[PDB]
Amino acid sequence: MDLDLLDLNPRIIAAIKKAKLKSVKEVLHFSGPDLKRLTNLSSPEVWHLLRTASLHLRGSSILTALQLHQQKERFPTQHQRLSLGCPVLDALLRGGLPLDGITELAGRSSAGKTQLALQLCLAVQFPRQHGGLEAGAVYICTEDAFPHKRLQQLMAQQPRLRTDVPGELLQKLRFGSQIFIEHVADVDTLLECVNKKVPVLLSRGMARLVVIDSVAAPFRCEFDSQASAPRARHLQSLGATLRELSSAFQSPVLCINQVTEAMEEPLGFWDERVSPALGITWANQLLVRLLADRLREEEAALGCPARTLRVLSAPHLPPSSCSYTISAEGVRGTPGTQSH
Amino acid sequence: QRDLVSFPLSPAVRVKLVSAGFQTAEELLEVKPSELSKEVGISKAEALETLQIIRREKKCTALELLEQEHTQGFIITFCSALDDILGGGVPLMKTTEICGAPGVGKTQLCMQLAVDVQIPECFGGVAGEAVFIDTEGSFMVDRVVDLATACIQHLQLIAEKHKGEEHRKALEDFTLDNILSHIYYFRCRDYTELLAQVYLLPDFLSEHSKVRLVIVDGIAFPFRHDLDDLSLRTRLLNGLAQQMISLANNHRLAVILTNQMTTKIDRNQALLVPALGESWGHAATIRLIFHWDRKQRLATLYKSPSQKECTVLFQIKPQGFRDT
Amino acid sequence: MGVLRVGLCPGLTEEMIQLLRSHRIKTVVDLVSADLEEVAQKCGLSYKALVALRRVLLAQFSAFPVNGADLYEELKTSTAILSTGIGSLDKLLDAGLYTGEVTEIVGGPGSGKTQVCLCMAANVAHGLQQNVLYVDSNGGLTASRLLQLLQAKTQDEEEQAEALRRIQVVHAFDIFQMLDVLQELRGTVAQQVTGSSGTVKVVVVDSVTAVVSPLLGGQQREGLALMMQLARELKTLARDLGMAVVVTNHITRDRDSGRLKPALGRSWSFVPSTRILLDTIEGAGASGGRRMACLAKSSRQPTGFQEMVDIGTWG
Ligand SMILES: Nc1ncnc2c1ncn2[C@@H]1O[C@H](COP(=O)(O)OP(=O)(O)OP(=O)(O)O)[C@@H](O)[C@H]1O
Ligand SMILES: Nc1ncnc2c1ncn2[C@@H]1O[C@H](COP(=O)(O)OP(=O)(O)OP(=O)(O)O)[C@@H](O)[C@H]1O
Ligand SMILES: Nc1ncnc2c1ncn2[C@@H]1O[C@H](COP(=O)(O)OP(=O)(O)O)[C@@H](O)[C@H]1O
Ligand SMILES: [Mg+2]
Ligand SMILES: [Mg+2]
């Protein structure tokens, strides 16, 4: 259906037609011996066929790194960033979340993950100059009900938080109508949702941000310590699908994760009391891994809770940390607190 | 006596030829194609292509190989102890594979090797190019810029300390824009795209003969998802390894591959082992593993045909891959 | 036989081949399978010329069986003994390695197969002063290791320089390349029957599994045929031309159902003559050059004997 335009000899295309090969993806799916036995023809013509199919699929532009560096507008994924709404957090993240790959947020309960997720959901609708993407967001609740009251309070207090942006266009922004909420209850339900509903929303352009309220919640209620292989298969499939969608539509994916204690009797966590859940198979699918921690009254006997946001690993970010507080306006980082 | 099975003949022409009763090319060499076509019921085109493919299908000893490998240098790593343990750096004409836990520094090492391959021969480099194939999207230009700036600062420092005119002559060409234009970028989001790019590599290397390094940052990700059939994966991996080693030996390159670690619950205490099964274990000439120990990164050589395995410490600074 | 050519056999003409290929009998196999009387009288051809042609055709195409004792005295001197540096196999091989047999080593990653091949090649080239051909298929050769091995036995530059030039190395990454290399070697040594020096006596293949592993898989049959043809030509080379051939291989499933076995399936098991299963020790004494060597198949001595081989301190 598509290999017809390729230059070739009639014998090989007749063999392809007799062998029921549809597109270049199908022929690249099979290997050397498989194609040789299917077409029943010599090796050099198979090599020529593979070369021609590869040249058809790709291999046109010689893209150097100067084209990546200088041409800012040609490759937004390498330069454009999604701001977190607070200058201190953006400085810690050197601009914000990347537009490609998966970003993980992990921590214990009552740490402030949902507040950051809501702030990122609101912050995506700003124009590109103000650190937004001029699009909506998708929220997938996997554990419990969505906090509508807190979202309404944040929307009401939004003019107070965005002090730098002048407020003439703030009233034009319709925050409520550009946020989509979904609910799931099983691992299979979440897989079906990400397979079917999410691409429809991203392709048509309603939203350019995907948030999962708790990826670890469905997986902790089905698989025990003796069923690691099916869980690994499901995690690999979900990660592959999410990465493919994010790369295709240039939409950041933010995943919220839970933690489990060390239970001291590796992966880089030597003296840490808690570690991200879902094992190492899930950790291989991510790009930037964060961690939000709260020191309890033992260290928080000073009057107010102590919250620190830490960077665990990233291809372009040193391991750092800062501090932040949660108020009626949102999440704000404490100035002059970044650690080196 | 040469059996026809040992030739790249099409199965149809081979089967009809052996049905006729010919079992040696020495007598196919002189048979006129007219009666050849008449006897076995074929046409002129297949006869001539069989004749040419049969007729178409050097003497280097150990001394020549030793001299040749002494002529070409090694790729610096900017880690002195790692260079010492590896015999002087990453060797050419061989496939090198690196494993390690996520967030350990494999991508940093790949970026440093991409930068380090452009060091002029006067300072002790190889002065070549680099090809970077990304399968995960973890290629950030800012980190490469920072690494190149650190490298050029160190190079200027050592050149000034040497106080030699020839060193200065090889620095004005060594500018940030020039070196950063010698890294060719690709991106394969699927294993089929990666395979197609691999098939297309030899022509690209023929066009650009100055390339001395090929990097494939991540081969486990394309093959570890959405592949239920293990035999197909094994065949694809074996073919890819054979093609990569063939490219390395044909074009005098240094293939760099990146792998992933997987937990194995042995006895009762789980330990990390490289992924992609056990058959893949000896598909790479050299195997390197990066540990974590206790807040200390260790680079332990695992398999090599030249040096015994040992252990070396290292760490990552805002300037790149460094020792100490 | 193909088409008629002058000089194949005395008394051939175009009328004979025309009538025979008209009678649906052209090749030698069916001509000899069919009764000589049938073609002689049914076609009306002369009996004497026909029987003379058949006898001269068989005689020049056959191998006449010979007596045993005479070939035994000639093989008493034709054979040779090659030592690598350890006598574990030497004692269990009738006190000497066989030149003209297909021996092989099966070992996993980091076992030391190519180390054994390298040390054996160095010992053969330097100590015994004969040419040796080495075939590499995965880039497992480095000349620095060869130089280091040679320096452990000699301290003179001239001997090291001379020894290296008698070790010939060729790169083959596909089965067709390997077949072409071996066929070229066969042709060259056939042309060099007159000469007495410069002929390689030891042929080493670094890895026969890696070349042929992509060809396996699926439900087809051409890969098995290719590997069988490679085995047959290797055996013919080693037997006819009196060469010592050494190849390597990998292991297969170690699970409960299947014990540690050589790769390439059951069909490859009948190919070699001697098997050496290198292995690594566990617990105390691990790492380094400590490797356990065992003899699985020899077909000449009792098997199942385990020994110790050190490589780190050896050469
Ligand atoms: N005005 C405020 N409105 C809401 N929360 C506030 C306010 N001031 C402080 N907070 C703090 O905000 C925190 C909200 O916790 P949050 O829901 O983010 O926790 P989480 O465990 O990360 O969430 P989830 O389990 O839903 O992922 C509370 O612990 C509370 O102390
Ligand atoms: N399938 C294989 N293909 C190639 N070489 C192999 C294979 N399996 C094992 N080896 C060889 O086994 C050897 C065992 O590792 P070891 O570290 O002992 O060797 P080495 O580097 O030669 O050691 P030393 O320099 O101390 O003598 C490796 O060097 C490797 O070349
Ligand atoms: N600009 C920088 N300054 C200092 N350290 C950095 C910088 N960028 C990255 N790093 C460190 O280098 C490491 C890179 O790991 P990475 O290459 O992402 O591993 P992997 O490739 O296995 O994901 C991170 O742990 C990070 O802490
Ligand atoms: Mg929360
Ligand atoms: Mg990486």
Side-chain angles (χ1 to χ4, degrees), chain B residues 134-149:
Chain B
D134 193 355
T135 52
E136 315 179 332
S138 59
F139 190 71
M140 308 271 138
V141 294
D142 293 331
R143 191 66 177 141
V144 189
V145 164
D146 300 340
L147 260 52
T149 291

PDB file of all heavy atoms in Angstrom, chain B residues 134-149:
ATOM      1  N   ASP B 134      19.634   8.414  20.143  1.00  0.00           N
ATOM      2  CA  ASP B 134      18.898   8.493  21.395  1.00  0.00           C
ATOM      3  C   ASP B 134      17.594   7.718  21.270  1.00  0.00           C
ATOM      4  O   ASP B 134      16.819   7.944  20.334  1.00  0.00           O
ATOM      5  CB  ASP B 134      18.618   9.951  21.767  1.00  0.00           C
ATOM      6  CG  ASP B 134      18.148  10.111  23.199  1.00  0.00           C
ATOM      7  OD1 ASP B 134      17.950   9.089  23.887  1.00  0.00           O
ATOM      8  OD2 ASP B 134      17.981  11.268  23.638  1.00  0.00           O
ATOM      9  N   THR B 135      17.356   6.809  22.213  1.00  0.00           N
ATOM     10  CA  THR B 135      16.133   6.022  22.253  1.00  0.00           C
ATOM     11  C   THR B 135      15.253   6.359  23.449  1.00  0.00           C
ATOM     12  O   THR B 135      14.173   5.776  23.589  1.00  0.00           O
ATOM     13  CB  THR B 135      16.464   4.526  22.267  1.00  0.00           C
ATOM     14  OG1 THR B 135      17.397   4.249  23.318  1.00  0.00           O
ATOM     15  CG2 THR B 135      17.068   4.104  20.938  1.00  0.00           C
ATOM     16  N   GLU B 136      15.683   7.280  24.312  1.00  0.00           N
ATOM     17  CA  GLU B 136      14.921   7.656  25.492  1.00  0.00           C
ATOM     18  C   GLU B 136      14.618   9.144  25.580  1.00  0.00           C
ATOM     19  O   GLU B 136      13.787   9.536  26.408  1.00  0.00           O
ATOM     20  CB  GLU B 136      15.660   7.224  26.770  1.00  0.00           C
ATOM     21  CG  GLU B 136      16.214   5.809  26.724  1.00  0.00           C
ATOM     22  CD  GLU B 136      16.954   5.431  27.991  1.00  0.00           C
ATOM     23  OE1 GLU B 136      17.505   6.336  28.653  1.00  0.00           O
ATOM     24  OE2 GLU B 136      16.984   4.228  28.327  1.00  0.00           O
ATOM     25  N   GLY B 137      15.256   9.980  24.764  1.00  0.00           N
ATOM     26  CA  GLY B 137      15.009  11.405  24.821  1.00  0.00           C
ATOM     27  C   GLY B 137      15.749  12.138  25.914  1.00  0.00           C
ATOM     28  O   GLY B 137      15.353  13.250  26.275  1.00  0.00           O
ATOM     29  N   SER B 138      16.816  11.551  26.456  1.00  0.00           N
ATOM     30  CA  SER B 138      17.567  12.142  27.553  1.00  0.00           C
ATOM     31  C   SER B 138      18.780  12.938  27.081  1.00  0.00           C
ATOM     32  O   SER B 138      19.748  13.079  27.838  1.00  0.00           O
ATOM     33  CB  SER B 138      18.007  11.054  28.535  1.00  0.00           C
ATOM     34  OG  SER B 138      18.808  10.081  27.889  1.00  0.00           O
ATOM     35  N   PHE B 139      18.755  13.456  25.856  1.00  0.00           N
ATOM     36  CA  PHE B 139      19.856  14.249  25.313  1.00  0.00           C
ATOM     37  C   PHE B 139      19.512  15.724  25.482  1.00  0.00           C
ATOM     38  O   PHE B 139      18.666  16.263  24.764  1.00  0.00           O
ATOM     39  CB  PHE B 139      20.110  13.901  23.850  1.00  0.00           C
ATOM     40  CG  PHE B 139      21.366  14.505  23.292  1.00  0.00           C
ATOM     41  CD1 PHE B 139      22.608  14.044  23.691  1.00  0.00           C
ATOM     42  CD2 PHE B 139      21.304  15.539  22.375  1.00  0.00           C
ATOM     43  CE1 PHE B 139      23.766  14.600  23.180  1.00  0.00           C
ATOM     44  CE2 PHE B 139      22.458  16.099  21.861  1.00  0.00           C
ATOM     45  CZ  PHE B 139      23.690  15.629  22.265  1.00  0.00           C
ATOM     46  N   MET B 140      20.170  16.377  26.435  1.00  0.00           N
ATOM     47  CA  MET B 140      19.981  17.796  26.700  1.00  0.00           C
ATOM     48  C   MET B 140      21.210  18.563  26.232  1.00  0.00           C
ATOM     49  O   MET B 140      22.338  18.223  26.604  1.00  0.00           O
ATOM     50  CB  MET B 140      19.726  18.049  28.187  1.00  0.00           C
ATOM     51  CG  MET B 140      18.615  17.193  28.773  1.00  0.00           C
ATOM     52  SD  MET B 140      16.995  17.972  28.636  1.00  0.00           S
ATOM     53  CE  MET B 140      15.990  16.575  28.140  1.00  0.00           C
ATOM     54  N   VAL B 141      20.986  19.594  25.415  1.00  0.00           N
ATOM     55  CA  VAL B 141      22.097  20.333  24.823  1.00  0.00           C
ATOM     56  C   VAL B 141      22.833  21.164  25.867  1.00  0.00           C
ATOM     57  O   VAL B 141      24.030  21.435  25.718  1.00  0.00           O
ATOM     58  CB  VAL B 141      21.594  21.208  23.660  1.00  0.00           C
ATOM     59  CG1 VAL B 141      21.089  20.334  22.525  1.00  0.00           C
ATOM     60  CG2 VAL B 141      20.501  22.151  24.134  1.00  0.00           C
ATOM     61  N   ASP B 142      22.141  21.597  26.925  1.00  0.00           N
ATOM     62  CA  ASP B 142      22.776  22.447  27.929  1.00  0.00           C
ATOM     63  C   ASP B 142      23.906  21.718  28.644  1.00  0.00           C
ATOM     64  O   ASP B 142      24.974  22.296  28.890  1.00  0.00           O
ATOM     65  CB  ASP B 142      21.732  22.938  28.932  1.00  0.00           C
ATOM     66  CG  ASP B 142      20.731  23.892  28.311  1.00  0.00           C
ATOM     67  OD1 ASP B 142      21.096  24.596  27.347  1.00  0.00           O
ATOM     68  OD2 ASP B 142      19.577  23.937  28.786  1.00  0.00           O
ATOM     69  N   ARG B 143      23.688  20.448  28.995  1.00  0.00           N
ATOM     70  CA  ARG B 143      24.735  19.673  29.650  1.00  0.00           C
ATOM     71  C   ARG B 143      25.938  19.490  28.732  1.00  0.00           C
ATOM     72  O   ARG B 143      27.088  19.564  29.180  1.00  0.00           O
ATOM     73  CB  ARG B 143      24.182  18.320  30.094  1.00  0.00           C
ATOM     74  CG  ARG B 143      25.107  17.539  31.008  1.00  0.00           C
ATOM     75  CD  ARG B 143      25.278  18.245  32.341  1.00  0.00           C
ATOM     76  NE  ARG B 143      26.109  17.478  33.261  1.00  0.00           N
ATOM     77  CZ  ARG B 143      27.003  18.011  34.083  1.00  0.00           C
ATOM     78  NH1 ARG B 143      27.213  19.316  34.123  1.00  0.00           N
ATOM     79  NH2 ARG B 143      27.704  17.213  34.884  1.00  0.00           N
ATOM     80  N   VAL B 144      25.689  19.250  27.444  1.00  0.00           N
ATOM     81  CA  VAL B 144      26.781  19.120  26.483  1.00  0.00           C
ATOM     82  C   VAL B 144      27.554  20.428  26.375  1.00  0.00           C
ATOM     83  O   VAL B 144      28.787  20.430  26.285  1.00  0.00           O
ATOM     84  CB  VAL B 144      26.238  18.667  25.114  1.00  0.00           C
ATOM     85  CG1 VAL B 144      27.383  18.316  24.180  1.00  0.00           C
ATOM     86  CG2 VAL B 144      25.296  17.485  25.282  1.00  0.00           C
ATOM     87  N   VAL B 145      26.842  21.557  26.375  1.00  0.00           N
ATOM     88  CA  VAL B 145      27.501  22.860  26.312  1.00  0.00           C
ATOM     89  C   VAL B 145      28.387  23.066  27.534  1.00  0.00           C
ATOM     90  O   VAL B 145      29.532  23.523  27.426  1.00  0.00           O
ATOM     91  CB  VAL B 145      26.455  23.982  26.176  1.00  0.00           C
ATOM     92  CG1 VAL B 145      27.072  25.333  26.502  1.00  0.00           C
ATOM     93  CG2 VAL B 145      25.866  23.989  24.777  1.00  0.00           C
ATOM     94  N   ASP B 146      27.869  22.732  28.719  1.00  0.00           N
ATOM     95  CA  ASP B 146      28.659  22.882  29.939  1.00  0.00           C
ATOM     96  C   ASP B 146      29.895  21.989  29.914  1.00  0.00           C
ATOM     97  O   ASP B 146      30.993  22.420  30.292  1.00  0.00           O
ATOM     98  CB  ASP B 146      27.798  22.570  31.163  1.00  0.00           C
ATOM     99  CG  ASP B 146      26.595  23.485  31.278  1.00  0.00           C
ATOM    100  OD1 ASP B 146      26.615  24.575  30.669  1.00  0.00           O
ATOM    101  OD2 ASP B 146      25.629  23.116  31.979  1.00  0.00           O
ATOM    102  N   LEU B 147      29.733  20.739  29.473  1.00  0.00           N
ATOM    103  CA  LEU B 147      30.868  19.825  29.401  1.00  0.00           C
ATOM    104  C   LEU B 147      31.915  20.321  28.413  1.00  0.00           C
ATOM    105  O   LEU B 147      33.120  20.255  28.688  1.00  0.00           O
ATOM    106  CB  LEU B 147      30.388  18.423  29.019  1.00  0.00           C
ATOM    107  CG  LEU B 147      30.245  17.407  30.155  1.00  0.00           C
ATOM    108  CD1 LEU B 147      29.404  17.972  31.290  1.00  0.00           C
ATOM    109  CD2 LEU B 147      29.649  16.106  29.642  1.00  0.00           C
ATOM    110  N   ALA B 148      31.475  20.824  27.257  1.00  0.00           N
ATOM    111  CA  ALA B 148      32.412  21.354  26.272  1.00  0.00           C
ATOM    112  C   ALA B 148      33.140  22.581  26.803  1.00  0.00           C
ATOM    113  O   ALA B 148      34.337  22.754  26.552  1.00  0.00           O
ATOM    114  CB  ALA B 148      31.677  21.686  24.974  1.00  0.00           C
ATOM    115  N   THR B 149      32.433  23.451  27.530  1.00  0.00           N
ATOM    116  CA  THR B 149      33.081  24.619  28.118  1.00  0.00           C
ATOM    117  C   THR B 149      34.137  24.209  29.137  1.00  0.00           C
ATOM    118  O   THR B 149      35.247  24.755  29.149  1.00  0.00           O
ATOM    119  CB  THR B 149      32.033  25.528  28.761  1.00  0.00           C
ATOM    120  OG1 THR B 149      31.231  26.131  27.736  1.00  0.00           O
ATOM    121  CG2 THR B 149      32.699  26.623  29.581  1.00  0.00           C
TER     122      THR B 149
END
